[PDB]
């Protein structure tokens, strides 16, 4: 159904590659963990009306933890030893491997990270109502959409580049509102405080952007080529790592920076 299920099935993932996702996917889970800690002990730093990023930064970590924790027992589970070729092959007996943990992850922090800016930054000429109510709008579009998609990427690589493609317009307005948001909070914050928002603006971007790399990262070299195989496989599944704790870990503690320097 997807290509990590396609490689394991026919060419099969080497020792090195099946170790090294599994570690990089525990690695992933494992820093959500430290991150939950991070936020609820930290949240005594920042005065009471920027607590509410600490709280979403809080729960993001719970989704992340859970969920990626998951989908690592479904990567590990979904592949078994052939002593007799010497790699690790697609399980029949198992549960195959899944991308809808990840997806799901997505789905419910979207709404959260976008909306937590808007706790520490204020608004000048927007409304929050409508800043926020077109960043619950795109950022669920452009995830149901890149799941849709995804069902697709062995299937029919054609539906699979145009749902990345309806995905990435509502991905592209989403860094539209994003980049008012920033251009007005930076009004009336203090020099060092608007250092740190272009900073977060920066981050955001790339964090954001490595997404849908990962998302292409096999069909990047060609249909026949070096990232069409086991390490197209590795270099997605380490490319969404990086890209987890980013956008969630630092990305939340950014924010907090943040709240600790505007109350001065
Ligand atoms: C885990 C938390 C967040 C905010 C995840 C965000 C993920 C993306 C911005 C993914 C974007 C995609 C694009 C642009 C196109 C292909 C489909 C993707 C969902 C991978
Ligand atoms: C030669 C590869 C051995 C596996 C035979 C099956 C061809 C690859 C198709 C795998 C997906 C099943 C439809
Ligand atoms: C100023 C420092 C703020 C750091 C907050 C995030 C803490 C976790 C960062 C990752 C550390 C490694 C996680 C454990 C790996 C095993
Ligand atoms: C100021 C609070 C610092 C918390 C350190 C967290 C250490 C890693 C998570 C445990
Ligand atoms: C300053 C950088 C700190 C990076 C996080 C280290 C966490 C160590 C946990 C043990
Ligand atoms: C509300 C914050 C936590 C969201 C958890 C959503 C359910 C996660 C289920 C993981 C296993 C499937
Ligand atoms: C609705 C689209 C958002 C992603 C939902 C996918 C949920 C997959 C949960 C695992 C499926 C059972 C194994
Ligand atoms: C304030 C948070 C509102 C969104 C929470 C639910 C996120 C999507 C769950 C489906
Ligand atoms: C000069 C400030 C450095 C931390 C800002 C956030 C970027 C960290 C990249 C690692
Ligand atoms: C702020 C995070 C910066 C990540 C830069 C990209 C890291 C390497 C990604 C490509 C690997 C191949
Ligand atoms: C909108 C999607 C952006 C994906 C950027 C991929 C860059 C690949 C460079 C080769
Ligand atoms: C401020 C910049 C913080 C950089 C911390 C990066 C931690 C990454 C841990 C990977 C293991």
Redesign the pocket.
Same mark, same amino acid.
């Given at each position: 159904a997807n290509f990590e299920n396609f490689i394991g099935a026919t060419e099969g993932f080497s020792e090195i590659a099946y170790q090294f996702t599994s570690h990089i996917l525990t690695?992933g889970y494992a *820093?959500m963990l430290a991150g939950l800690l991070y936020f609820i002990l930290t949240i005594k730093n920042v005065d009471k009306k920027f607590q509410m990023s600490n709280i979403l930064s809080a729960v993001v970590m719970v989704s992340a933890f859970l969920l990626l924790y998951a989908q690592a027992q479904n990567w590990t589970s979904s592949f078994t030893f052939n002593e007799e070729v010497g790699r690790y092959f697609l399980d029949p007996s198992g549960d195959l491997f899944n991308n809808g943990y990840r997806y799901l992850n997505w789905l419910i922090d979207v709404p959260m990270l976008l909306f937590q800016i808007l706790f520490v930054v204020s608004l000048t000429t927007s409304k929050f109502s409508s800043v926020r109510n077109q960043f619950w709008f795109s950022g669920a579009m452009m995830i149901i959409t890149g799941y849709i998609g995804q069902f697709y990427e062995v299937s029919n690589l054609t539906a699979f580049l145009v749902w990345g493609a309806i995905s990435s317009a509502f991905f592209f307005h989403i860094l539209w509102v994003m980049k008012k948001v920033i251009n007005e909070g930076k009004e009336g914050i203090s020099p060092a405080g608007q250092k740190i928002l272009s900073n977060i603006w920066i981050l955001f971007l790339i964090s954001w952007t490595l997404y849908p790399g990962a998302y292409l990262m096999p069909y990047l070299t060609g249909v026949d080529g070096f990232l069409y195989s086991e390490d197209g496989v590795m270099a997605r599944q380490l490319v969404y790592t990086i890209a987890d *704790?980013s956008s969630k870990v630092?990305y939340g *503690?950014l924010l907090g920076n943040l709240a600790i320097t505007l109350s001065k």
């Open positions: 690695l *820093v *704790v630092i *503690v």
